[PDB]
């Protein structure tokens, strides 16, 4: 349960975990305390998962922007660095780790996204984004690209989005306005609109991720790329003469990259708080310490004044700083999680074409500024759905095995059809279901709200969905089939007064109902119930309300 006498450390996979491991070996040889450095995936969300239960690592490394939330949740311990030690680090990096007036982590280094270009290919990197498309046009003539960076993380595309006017939370009087979100204003829209047009014009792929971008650049397939200090290490070992410089300017204005401060926090549930402090203060946060780490993968501008002055001569670090000035420090408030997820969803939906720029930034702006009013409405619909089945003798008189069987694969469509008729727009704020699925869910749902069905149509349709003869191992299969046919005949008579239009309505409603049946029951739980009642077994819960279990 977080073992005593040992020290487990978690750090992102793109950092110099090997260099850190070495500092751990030196630490282990001196104190006799084992130190294991792990780098799990989705660490950003995996830490809080276990941290709450009481387990997890003793020390956690990540940008300050997340620590604020972990603090509120009570997953971190307030560090106790004596005055003397504080003076060794820049007072500028101490604010990044200060939440509600308490230091919640040790500052390690300041990182900022910069433009990395291949000198041999581009002796002169572009000054503006606008001039990139044309630059890609000819580079292609030689089987090469112009720009290639990760599009799966809004962190990389933010500089462009905020360039014109986009921003997370308005800042005034040393305070953040959790209600003022600028992710769907004129500025943000233009920026993301440019990014999309780059994909549409085949100047960039939508599925491009971190790995793809890195490989493509280190192999000389792309002329430029956007990354942080940690990425300079792998480029060196590759035959590429790169150069780190200021990011392109969009619409005359500079790109404002979010500045982050790599920080180390101590788990509030660890019995090695002292062993931790000792390690982060007398080993890692030292000239030799940060050098070992930096040696593996660059840390940018280290918080340790002494070691910072040595690397200050590095032209690459200077570029990172130039870019950092143009940008702004990341907020560390609890809502930052909701923000990032909302933005991540918008950028990916727009790049993949599942949504338009306006549609994407529309939902993000609403989700970024998060009520579980959605879930509470799903619960009402579910209960409603139970009352609907308790009535309707046709279903109550069916064999119990059939009742449980029809329920096992119909509660989904039945429930969704309930949300529709109950007129409840949803705000999926999941601060892991696939975006494609979620997007498909709402499209179908909005399809019902625009078709404007009546009370009869809904009722007869529900019958068509409930009594499904195709359900494997069904006893009263023939009778159920006769029941579905009746509902289908009724659904038609309610649409019979026609001359022209009602004809395309039956096919429309029908196909729409079919898309409902193709929605993962698992997805429904994670989107409407889990967030309010933890893990849940709908089939089980429903058989209880209907006394079938």
């Amino acid at each position: 349960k977080i073992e005593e006498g040992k020290l487990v450390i978690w750090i992102n996979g793109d950092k110099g975990y090997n260099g850190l491991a070495e500092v751990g070996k030196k630490f282990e040889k001196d104190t006799g305390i084992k130190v294991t450095v792990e780098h799990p995936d989705k660490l950003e969300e995996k830490f809080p998962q276990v941290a709450a239960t009481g387990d997890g690592p003793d020390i956690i490394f990540w940008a300050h922007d997340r620590f604020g939330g972990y603090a509120q949740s009570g997953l971190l311990a307030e560090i106790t660095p004596d005055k003397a030690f504080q003076d060794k680090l820049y007072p500028f990096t101490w604010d990044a780790v200060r939440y509600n007036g308490k230091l919640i982590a040790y500052p390690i280094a300041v990182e900022a996204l910069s433009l990395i270009y291949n000198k041999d290919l581009l002796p002169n990197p572009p000054k503006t984004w606008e001039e990139i498309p044309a630059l890609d046009k000819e580079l292609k003539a030689k089987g090469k690209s112009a720009l290639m960076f990760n599009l799966q993380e809004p962190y990389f595309t933010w500089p462009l989005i905020a360039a014109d006017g986009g921003y997370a939370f308005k800042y005034e009087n040393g305070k953040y306005d959790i209600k003022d979100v600028g992710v769907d204003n004129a500025g943000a829209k233009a920026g993301l609109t440019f990014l999309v047009d780059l994909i549409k014009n085949k100047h960039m792929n939508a599925d491009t991720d971190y790995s793809i971008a890195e490989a493509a650049f280190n192999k000389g397939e792309t002329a430029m790329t956007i990354n942080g200090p940690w990425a300079w290490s792998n480029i060196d070992t590759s035959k590429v003469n790169y150069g780190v410089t200021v990011l392109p300017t969009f619409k005359g204005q500079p790109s404002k990259p979010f500045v982050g401060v790599l920080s180390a926090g101590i788990n509030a549930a660890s019995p090695n708080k002292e062993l931790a402090k000792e390690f982060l203060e007398n080993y890692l946060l030292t000239d030799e310490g940060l050098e070992a780490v930096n040696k593996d993968k660059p840390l940018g501008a280290v918080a340790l004044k002494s070691y910072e002055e040595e690397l200050a001569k590095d032209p690459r670090i200077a570029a990172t700083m130039e870019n950092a000035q143009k940008g702004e420090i990341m907020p560390n408030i609890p809502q930052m999680s909701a923000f990032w997820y909302a933005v991540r969803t918008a950028v990916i939906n727009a790049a993949s074409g599942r949504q338009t720029v306006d549609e994407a930034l529309k939902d993000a702006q609403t989700n970024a500024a998060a009520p579980h009013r959605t879930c509470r409405e799903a619960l009402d619909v579910l209960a409603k759905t139970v009352a609907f089945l308790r009535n309707l003798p046709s279903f109550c008189h069916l064999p119990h095995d059939d009742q449980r069987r029809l329920l096992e694969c119909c509660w989904g469509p039945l429930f969704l059809l309930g949300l529709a008729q109950d007129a409840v727009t949803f705000e999926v704020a999941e601060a892991q279901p696939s975006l494609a699925a979620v997007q498909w869910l709402q499209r179908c749902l909005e399809s019902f709200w625009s078709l404007e069905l009546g009370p009869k149509e809904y009722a007869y349709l529900k019958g068509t969905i409930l009594f499904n003869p195709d359900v494997p191992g069904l006893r009263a299969s023939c009778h159920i089939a006769h029941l579905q046919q009746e509902a289908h005949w009724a659904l038609c008579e309610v649409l019979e007064p026609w001359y022209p239009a009602s004809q395309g309505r039956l096919a429309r409603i029908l196909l729409m109902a079919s898309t409902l049946r193709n929605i993962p029951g698992t997805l429904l739980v994670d989107l409407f119930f889990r967030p309010i009642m933890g893990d849940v077994d709908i089939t089980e819960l429903l058989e209880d309300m209907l006394l079938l279990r």
Binding site: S394, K456, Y458
Partner: peptide
Amino acid sequence: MHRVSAALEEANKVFL
């Protein structure tokens, strides 16, 4: 086994 229509309309009233 018939007139399931009238039944459905009545049973789904809870959603009005």
